[PDB]
């Protein structure tokens, strides 16, 4: 079963391709409508694979150096194996002298095509956590942020290193301990500093970065005594907040103390930067923070000069291998559009709420430190992804949280996509859900994903994933290829392409051109007869995914703030397929007396009066009460023991909501609305050219028309 095949390959190898059968010729390879790409999750979880404390087998070929995999032909009599990538034959290492046909290594069983090795050789480096705290916020917002950072302190390992950088108008780099004085270094938040200057101006562990088991006592007291930025805020003004400088000092500090080692720069902001490099807006309250309308009509002077400052810090720290998180909670915009490259280029998180004193932020912040069964953080550091392909496959590039290492070879394609021009990438921070999109070009077929990273325990590990897909039979080329098409993977992979060109500028024109082309090659129709157009089961969901994509907030940026659009695009470029389909096309369940909860369509026809809805947008859990049930609820039928069934109805969507309200890392905003309610707008905008019926009719007229 092709459906069974797609599901199993993602559960085992953490991959999902747009095409599972690849063009065996240069003819079809150039004419492929949707490119050959993969939705690869380097650290996907699975039913308890044994951590293989081996040393990965090294191919004797210098250029190749691919890892031993089940696709390699073995000879247990001659003690040799043939590398499936370069045909080079190798001699087994001494520790493999006793491998037999009845006792063979794990890296040759197809069940362990994806596998993780543990390399214990050098002394392990500790994890580093640098808190960067904004002090220009209300007392209730600062107090809750203090308690949350004190909570995360009690969850860190005893060997981890911690540091404190508070900032407002100035930047304070605290020296921990010091016994009875609590000292810190103050800097002007008006001029930037390089890592070399900061090193000379300041002077394994540091005076500023000490282990938790020795410093947690004083740090908890220091965080408990943190107070507002002492500088007054005159009437009609914003506070002088130096975000772009405190970040460059946080980057510069770790850059000269622990380069090339896992470290998290955790920045907490409660407003936009109003001073120094990286400025987002002025200090006068009469000038509103820039909007997309202000972006388009050139009414935003701080955007380009602000983004350039944060792209420089993003590339500085990603080169050093450090992670930047951005926890932004304020009532207005905070400047995420200008700082988006820091958590995007690195593997950093991006939490966005209204205030730090909310259940939304507090619970979301402790999800960051969610541990596994062995009590270890679900995060990896300093990942190095190298991709090795057959001599017939070239790599265009990757679209996701990564940075090019600019490594050249026979696998690099002249046509680059996203972060291309390389076969090696660095992901400073990865989680079990981090998903990359690699685009391949054709010039069995095999691809080997090698992921070297630092585990949250300090152990250096390597995750190897080798996959194989059949070349199309020459006498059944497009026929077999069409059946191996993954519409869900191709939809997100093509969406990953559109959001990239939009965020680095029409894009909707390219979307419709490719949708029509895909219809004209894999659809069934007579020419000039639109009613004769049908799609196979393999393709019958693709146009519906394109419909909700071109009308989504990812491409129709207006009706959102620039920060909200950058936040939506942030989480989309990182999630797996299951969550990505929810973002593009939210799922919707119905709750009524007539039947149990059932999934329903995303159209205005599903809105019934005597029914309760539960729409799951990845960012919003929304419960909608129809007009009849709202009146039945405003009346008071629930409290009466006569209608215990009406209590089941009103709380059935609540129960199902609580489950997915805890597993999802960016805890979605919970909405309880009804007919006539204000927040019912979120339901009516995701629902329903114009409508899908009209959109399909226009598509069929162009599919059966000229090619």
């Amino acid at each position: 079963t092709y459906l069974e095949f797609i599901q199993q390959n993602e559960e085992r190898d953490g991959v999902r391709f747009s095409w599972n059968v690849w063009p065996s010729s240069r003819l079809e390879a150039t004419r492929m409508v949707v490119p050959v790409a993969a939705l690869f999750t380097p650290l996907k979880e699975r039913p308890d694979l044994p951590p293989i404390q081996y040393e990965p087998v090294l191919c004797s070929r210098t250029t190749c150096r691919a890892v031993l995999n089940p696709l390699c032909q073995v000879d247990y009599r001659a003690k040799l194996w043939a590398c499936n990538f370069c045909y080079q034959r190798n001699q087994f290492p001494p520790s493999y002298a006793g491998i037999s046909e009845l006792n063979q290594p794990a890296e040759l069983l197809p069940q362990f095509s994806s596998i993780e090795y543990v390399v214990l050789r050098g002394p392990q480096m500790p994890l580093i956590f640098l808190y960067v705290v904004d002090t220009c916020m209300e007392d209730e917002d600062l107090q809750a942020l203090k308690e949350s950072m004190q909570m995360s302190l009690s969850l860190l390992p005893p060997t981890a290193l911690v540091g404190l950088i508070t900032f407002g108008r100035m930047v304070q780099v605290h020296e921990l301990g010091c016994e009875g004085i609590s000292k810190s270094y103050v800097f002007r938040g008006t001029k930037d500093l390089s890592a070399k200057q900061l090193q000379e101006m300041l002077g394994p562990s540091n005076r500023f970065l000490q282990p938790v088991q020795k410093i947690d006592m004083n740090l908890t007291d220091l965080l408990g005594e943190l107070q507002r930025d002492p500088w007054p805020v005159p009437q009609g003004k914003r506070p002088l907040r130096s975000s772009g400088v405190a970040l460059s000092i946080a980057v510069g500090l770790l850059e000269c103390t622990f380069p090339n080692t896992g470290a998290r720069i955790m920045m907490f902001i409660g407003g936009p930067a109003t001073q120094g490099p990286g400025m987002v807006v002025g200090d006068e309250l009469k000038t509103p923070i820039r909007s997309w309308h202000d972006i388009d009509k050139d009414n935003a002077k701080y955007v380009k000069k602000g983004t350039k400052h944060f792209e420089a810090l993003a590339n500085r720290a990603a080169t050093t291998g450090h992670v930047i998180d951005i926890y932004a909670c304020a009532l207005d915009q905070t400047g995420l559009l200008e700082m988006k490259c820091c958590p995007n280029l690195t593997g950093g998180y991006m939490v966005m709420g209204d205030s730090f004193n909310t259940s939304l932020f507090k619970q979301t912040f402790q999800r960051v430190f969610t541990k596994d069964m062995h009590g270890q953080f679900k995060m990896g550091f300093g990942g190095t992804l190298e991709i090795k392909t057959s001599r017939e496959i070239k790599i265009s590039g990757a679209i996701g949280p990564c940075v090019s290492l600019n490594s050249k070879g026979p696998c690099v394609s002249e046509n680059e996509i996203g972060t291309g021009g390389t076969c090696q990438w660095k992901i400073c921070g990865l989680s079990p859900t981090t998903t990359l999109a690699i685009y391949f070009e054709v010039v069995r077929g095999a691809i080997q994903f090698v992921t070297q990273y630092q585990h949250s325990s300090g152990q250096r590990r390597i995750r190897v994933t080798t996959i194989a897909r059949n070349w199309a039979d020459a006498q059944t080329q497009i026929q077999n290829i069409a059946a191996s098409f993954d519409q869900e993977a191709a939809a997100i992979l093509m969406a990953r392409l559109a959001i990239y060109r939009a965020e680095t500028e029409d894009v909707l024109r390219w979307l419709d051109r490719q949708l029509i082309r895909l219809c004209q090659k894999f659809g069934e129709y007579h020419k000039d007869d639109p009613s004769s157009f049908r799609f196979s089961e393999t393709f019958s969901l693709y146009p519906q995914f394109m419909f909700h994509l071109r009308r989504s907030s990812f491409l129709q940026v207006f009706n959102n703030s620039p920060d909200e659009s950058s936040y939506y695009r942030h989480h989309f470029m990182r999630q797996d397929l299951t969550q990505s389909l929810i973002m593009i096309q939210p799922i919707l369940y119905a709750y009524s007396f007539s039947g149990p909860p059932e999934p329903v369509l995303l159209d205005s026809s599903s809105i019934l009066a005597d029914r309760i809805l539960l729409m799951d947008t990845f960012f919003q859990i929304l419960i909608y009460h129809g007009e009849t049930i709202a009146q039945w609820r405003k009346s008071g039928y629930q409290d009466m023991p006569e209608y215990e069934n009406f209590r089941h109805l009103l709380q059935a969507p609540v129960d199902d909501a609580q489950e997915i309200l805890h597993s999802r890392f960016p805890m979605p905003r919970y909405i309880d609305t009804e007919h006539g309610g204000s927040q019912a707008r979120f339901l009516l905008s995701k629902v329903n050219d114009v409508s899908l019926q009209v959109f399909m009719d226009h598509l069929k007229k162009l599919a059966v028309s000229s090619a």
């Binding site: 009875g180 002007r188 101006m201 107070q227």
Partner: protein, 727 residues
């Protein structure tokens, strides 16, 4: 009026202390004259013309101690301040009342009207020293609060000295005794290669240390709680003073960024102003104000002084503009370029305090000296944002000032602070012949803000007669005041020209003066008023300021010159010519008038080893210190009954003070020593260490009458003077 032949006396120093001359004035005018300690002139009889002044070859000038502590002070609070409508001279006892409702100004001769507010019985006319309550027009801003900022060197060398321990303990003991009301503000700054601020808040568990490492661009890290209210934050300040000497025990910082540290301290006090106390122990080597090292001269280098940079001079002028005064405590063991650092105190009305080779365990003498000097420095009265005008009768003109201040336009002396231990000097000339009047008057008006927030004006008025003959000028000569003015003139000659020129001008001052007296009358003949003139000048030429063939180091000389330019006339004389007594044979010829106390009065001996004796002990009063030299063959009675010791060999090497024994010989010498220090506010430390072999017998370096291998004796000096007088 008699004439003295210095070549036959050789014993002209009186056995009793020297008294200033009484100006040849009317009995009723002299009785109202200013106290000679607050205000005195070199020539009590003013020469009528400049030609007469140049013929006498004696310098004309004034020496004033304006803010000295007084036993009694009349404070007038009149609703109006009577000043002359022309030269703004305050009404003084030396004006002329004619119409009973009109008075003649003694300085500009203009007649004024007496306001409806016996007019000659008014207290403003019966006291030469008085203090007014200035009206609202005499202040540029509301009275500033008392502000104290302490800046401490905390480098590795400074931590080794151990000065921070005693300085912080003295602050805790004298925290309530600091001058000021409930508006008092206090602050702290430490520094090595980086500048350290110290915020103080009651909402925080402890003070917070804020580091400014941007040395080329200092700034203020916090808008509040750096200069905090002492009344509200009393407890928070006491905790920091107990914790400061423990934060830098293991410090490896070797360089000191003094220049940038003072800039941050200036920016901190710039809004309000006040007193800035700076403690430094080594050469400034890092940042702006960096000074190059220098090799010390020996006894074999000739007279071949000036600042190395204008930084600390430019910085003091900015401090003066913001009413900030800088006192420099230098506790260095090596060269520190005090010729450049001293500019921070000379041009800001501050004062420097030098403690050579201070060490908490190795130099207990400097430790107790810093203890007593800080006891005075923190408890003496103080004035803020002050100015002083010096007015003299028409015809006389001030042309050169001496002291620690900034001369504003129109001869206005700027005093960011004014302290009761500062002395000043003024040199003047007869611009217009005084043929009209027979009296001249000098008035100094000191406008300042007290520690209680009150604009006050302290006024001193002096009156002197005018004479027109050479002999009448020499008759009113004040030999102690002439030596004080010549020492200030020679200090400027050193900076301007060289040290040889400063020494030649001092000898020519005695030659030309006595050569002119001889040309208007065999041996060396001098008037009675100048019988000690060659003695005090030879003492000047042997003081550490101008000595030549000695092993003196650079910082010792500049500090000896900073004390010439800043100390009052009395302590300048005590330093230059210490009073030597014999204190092993005290008797009952003393001042036993004061109740039970007897207070022996031994005669003053001359500063010669010939006057000493190995059979007894000799006490020397050098003003700031008291040295008791014990002879080797001293009597067993003085050893056991005064020193509490059984032999000369068991006298402790550094003896910080005498024991109060149960012997009448102890009571006599304790009474005599107590009487010495009661004459001064600065507690003079006594040390009986001077032995005949303690290697600390600089007691002999004060024997100015005797010859050395690098100077003349007093009698050798008189022979050289006579050789040039009748050349």
């Amino acid at each position: 009026l008699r004439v003295v032949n210095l070549l036959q006396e050789r014993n002209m120093l009186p056995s009793t202390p020297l008294k200033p001359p009484v100006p040849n004035l009317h009995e009723d005018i002299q009785k109202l004259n200013c106290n000679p300690e607050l205000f005195r002139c070199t020539l009590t009889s003013i020469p009528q013309t400049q030609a007469l002044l140049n013929k006498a070859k004696l310098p004309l000038g004034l020496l004033l101690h304006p803010f000295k502590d007084l036993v009694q002070l009349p404070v007038v609070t009149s609703s109006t301040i009577v000043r002359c409508r022309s030269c703004r001279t305050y009404i003084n006892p030396f004006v002329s009342f004619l119409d009973q409702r009109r008075w003649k100004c003694n300085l500009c001769y203009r007649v004024n009207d007496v306001p409806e507010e016996e007019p000659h019985r008014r207290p403003e006319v019966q006291n030469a020293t008085i203090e007014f309550m200035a009206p609202s027009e005499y202040m540029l801003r509301p009275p500033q609060p008392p502000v104290y900022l302490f800046v401490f060197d905390v480098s590795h060398n400074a931590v080794e000295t151990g000065y921070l321990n005693s300085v912080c303990q003295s602050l805790l003991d004298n925290l309530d005794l600091l001058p000021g009301n409930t508006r008092t503000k206090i602050g702290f700054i430490t520094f090595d290669s980086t500048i350290h601020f110290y915020g103080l808040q009651e909402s925080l568990s402890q003070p917070q240390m804020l580091i400014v490492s941007d040395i080329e661009d200092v700034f203020i890290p916090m808008p509040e709680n750096l200069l905090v209210n002492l009344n509200e934050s009393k407890e928070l300040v006491q905790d920091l003073l107990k914790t400061l000497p423990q934060m830098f025990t293991k410090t490896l910082e070797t360089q000191s960024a003094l220049g940038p540290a003072l800039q941050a301290a200036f920016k901190l006090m710039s809004p309000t102003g006040g007193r800035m106390s700076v403690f430094q122990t080594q050469l400034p080597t890092l940042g702006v104000g960096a000074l190059k090292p220098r090799e010390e001269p020996n006894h074999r280098s000739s007279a071949k002084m000036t600042p190395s940079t204008d930084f600390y001079k430019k910085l003091a002028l900015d401090c003066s503009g913001q009413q900030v005064a800088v006192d420099l405590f230098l506790l260095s063991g090596q060269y520190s370029d005090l010729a450049s650092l001293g500019c921070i105190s000379r041009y800001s009305a501050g004062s420097v305090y030098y403690y050579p080779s201070y060490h908490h365990q190795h130099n207990p003498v400097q430790v107790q000296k810093l203890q007593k000097e800080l006891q005075r420095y923190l408890t003496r009265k103080i004035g803020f944002e002050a100015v002083m005008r010096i007015r003299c009768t028409k015809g006389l003109s001030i042309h050169t000032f001496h002291g620690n201040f900034f001369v504003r336009s129109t001869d206005l002396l700027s005093l960011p602070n004014v302290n009761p231990d500062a002395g000043y000097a003024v040199q003047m000339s007869v611009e217009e012949s005084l043929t009209d009047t027979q009296l001249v008057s000098f008035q100094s008006a000191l406008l300042y803000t007290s520690s209680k927030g009150e604009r006050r004006i302290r006024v001193h008025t002096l009156c002197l007669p005018v004479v027109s003959t050479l002999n009448d000028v020499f008759l009113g000569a004040d030999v102690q005041a002439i030596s004080g003015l010549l020492a200030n003139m020679a200090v400027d000659r050193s900076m301007t020209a060289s040290l040889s020129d400063a020494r030649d001008a001092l000898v020519n001052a005695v030659i030309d003066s006595l050569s002119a007296y001889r040309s208007s009358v065999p041996g060396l003949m001098v008037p009675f008023s100048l019988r000690l003139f060659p003695l005090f000048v030879l003492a000047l030429l042997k003081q550490k300021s101008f000595q030549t063939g000695t092993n003196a180091r650079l910082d010792e000389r500049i500090f000896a010159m900073c004390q010439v330019k800043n100390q009052p006339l009395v302590y300048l004389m005590l330093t230059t010519h210490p009073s030597l007594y014999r204190v092993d044979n005290l008797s009952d010829e003393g001042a036993l008038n004061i109740s039970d106390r007897t207070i022996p009065q031994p005669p003053i001996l001359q500063l010669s080893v010939e006057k000493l004796s190995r059979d007894g002990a000799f006490l020397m009063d050098a003003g700031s210190v008291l040295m008791l030299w014990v002879g080797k063959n001293c009597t067993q009675n003085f050893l056991s009954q005064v020193l509490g010791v059984q032999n000369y060999a068991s006298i402790p090497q550094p003896m910080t003070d005498l024991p109060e024994l149960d012997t009448p010989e102890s009571a006599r010498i304790i009474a005599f020593i107590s009487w010495l220090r009661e004459q001064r506010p600065f507690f003079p430390i006594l040390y009986v260490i001077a032995d005949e072999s303690p290697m600390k017998a600089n007691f002999l370096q004060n024997m100015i009458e005797d010859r050395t291998e690098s100077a003349l004796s007093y009698y050798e000096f008189l022979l050289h003077i006579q050789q040039q007088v009748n050349k």
